[PDB]
Amino acid sequence: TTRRCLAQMLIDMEMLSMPQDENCTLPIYVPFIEYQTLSVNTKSLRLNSRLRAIVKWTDPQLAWDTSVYPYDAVMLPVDKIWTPVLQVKNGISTNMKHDANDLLVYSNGTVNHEVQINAEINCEVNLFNYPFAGDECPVAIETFSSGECVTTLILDQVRSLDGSTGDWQTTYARLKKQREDRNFIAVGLKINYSSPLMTLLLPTVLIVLADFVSFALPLHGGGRNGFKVTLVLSFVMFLNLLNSQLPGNGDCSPIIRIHFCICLVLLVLSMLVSMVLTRLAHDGSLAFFSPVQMLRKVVTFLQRLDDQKNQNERKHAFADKLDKIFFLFYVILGLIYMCVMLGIMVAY
Template sequence: MSYPPSVEGIRISESTNKCRNTDTSCTTRRCLAEMLINRNYSSQPQQECLHTVSVPLIEYQTLAVDTKKLRLRSRLQASLVWTDPELAWNTSVYPYDTVVLPVSKVWTPELQVTNGILTTMKHSSQDLLAYSNGTLKHNVIINAEVNCEVNLFNYPFASDECPVAIQSWALDDCGTQLEFGDVMMIDGNHGDWQTDGVELLRQGMRADRNYIMVALTIRYLNPFVTLMLPSILILLADMVSFALPLGGGERNSFKVTLVLSFTMFLIILNNELPGDSKCSPIIRTHFCVCLVLLVLSMLVSMVLTRLAKDGSLMFCCCPKRPAPKNTENKQEEEEEDEASFPTEAKADGSDTMKALEDEVGMLRKVVNFLEELDAKWLKN
């Protein structure tokens, strides 16, 4: 039998009202979900002022560790279980043990990272699972960035622990309290830091002071190769550079290049490490000492070059003092020096002979200067 459109609409609305009013003629799972949604319980269950929420599992993941700012970025996925008796139903009328409800229509607990600088919590899905006895299950995802005062004294061989405090809202014995289960770590390798393990701790006997203690260890290979090893090699090159000749300025220019190179590595170190940590890294002292040694070595090389060239350390335009030895001894020494030259060097040409004579002359000036100093010390 067909009905007018107005009559048909009235029949549909009556059928919907019967479903919402728990009419036994509408016993489908969706009809049950609509009935629970229409109860519109968006506030916390109020059987007791302090409601207990169980957290059977937390999956922890380290996203990044900022060594410069001393901050830890982490991701937590928590499973939540709580009870709301007013969302229970009679299984003899609705023969279903579970039903899916939208999160926006039901009260859900909120977790907080109390020591977090930036914290966001979002639902892992737009639905949750409700049981016939009033139990509800849901998952949430928390992204948190916390201050992590890692002890960097032994950098790049540093290791320390960082707490992530997880609480829920409670005030004057009202609100929610958390009961934790297991904490599981997933994917602990990120960048230069490695997560060795996580452990759930409680401060004292208080239920509202729960911490996930994260054990961190730095991967020393990358900092060692990029910072420690170059500093050692630069010092080694500086020590070997004394084999270069004093004349021509090759030694001085090489040492200046080493100092500039080391300064570049010092800037890189300053960009990697914080400037106000509780324990200053010992590698910073190591770099400062190495830089001082390089500068001193460069200054000594400059002084020796001046001494080899002029035979004196006086930086003034004064006439040179005559050498203490007479002319005959000088001629004899020059003859000995010429006799000491190998025949092959003489055959190379006048340029080679002149270079060798300059070298011998510089060394002779250094010897004369040292002899004068020795004579002054003996007189005193």
């Protein structure tokens, strides 16, 4: 008649099979399921989530008589009775773990048990606009149901421990329904653009801006072609860095990969013409690629030196005119593309 004696009696029954007496239909109630994201992967688009629920079903066999046993509750080990296994069918690698080794059983057979579910969900989000991205990620909650025997799951409330897990920030977790009366949790994911804008977008804009004014450096004075080659080799690192944390899957892929690619060609073309124009300034034409006697003598030499100075001046100004013509065309075209490229990344 002791409460522990009552607990021992229920264990000796060994009711390790589900309560399927009533048409093999078990309504399992899961009120106040708590959601939390542990980490979100950007390259693999995988979301790791933790689900802490409070399962509550009915076990008719685990119900004693309140007259012989004057008690209203008793707690038994989880492995001595049947316990449902909640699953996340939408994602991969779902695992359910018992929060505690004991569960509460009431006098009428109702069983209270809390579980913790860790699952990895292959999240699909429109990453066309990195970093300005965000999409709803469905997380399904299901229990085994085969053929005639079905165990419907009833969800009541969802509370989310919202907070950034890194680059991604979780905004909400709402309860919705699927087509065939399937309960799933709609998780809202957003990217904090404070970090990607400063580390990737701003240096890219500043580097391209430095290239536009890099034409101010005179061709003869030097420090221009070497100045531009460092800018170009900096975008090669940007392409490798950017590609290491972004999925180039297919349609609606991140456009910043295309934007970086176009800038690399634009900077290479800018260096290409400057290198050619340097030869034009030094040589005067683009053919490298294609296959009283004493007092009068000094006057002849002095005018010859002046003519040598004059031909240097004229050959160094014709190349400047081509450089000025290209600079006007390049900066307008570059600024037009930069505004258009950025405008697509925020409003398309």
